[PDB]
Amino acid sequence: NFNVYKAIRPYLAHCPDCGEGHSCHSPVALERIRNEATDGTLKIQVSLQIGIK
């Protein structure tokens, strides 16, 4: 159920913030980060997808 990630029209990005500073074609890259939840909760946006393929 809830199979939604067939429609992920790509935002394919050569990740600049790879290991030891410089760039690599990383799909695990962070694009947006939310921490404003006052309980120390960290909403992190990875450039890859889990769960639904």
Binding site: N1, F2, N3, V4, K6, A7, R9
Partner: protein, 60 residues
């Protein structure tokens, strides 16, 4: 309610000419549906009928 429109066809907002499985039938035309009906939440319910997808040949 109100009918949705792919710039020539006034279909019901969750019932297009390709009712259902819009992306399986027409992928890039569903992308043009995204480009055209981005104002329309009934189109988003059609997309939900492709997100909770219920195709013809797929029994789910």
């Amino acid at each position: 309610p109100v009918m949705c429109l792919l710039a020539n066809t006034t279909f019901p907002c969750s019932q297009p000419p390709c009712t259902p499985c819009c992306y399986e039938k027409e992928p890039e035309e569903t992308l043009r549906m995204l480009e055209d009906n981005v104002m329309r939440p009934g189109y988003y319910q059609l997309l939900q009928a492709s997100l909770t997808c219920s195709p013809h040949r797929q029994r789910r």
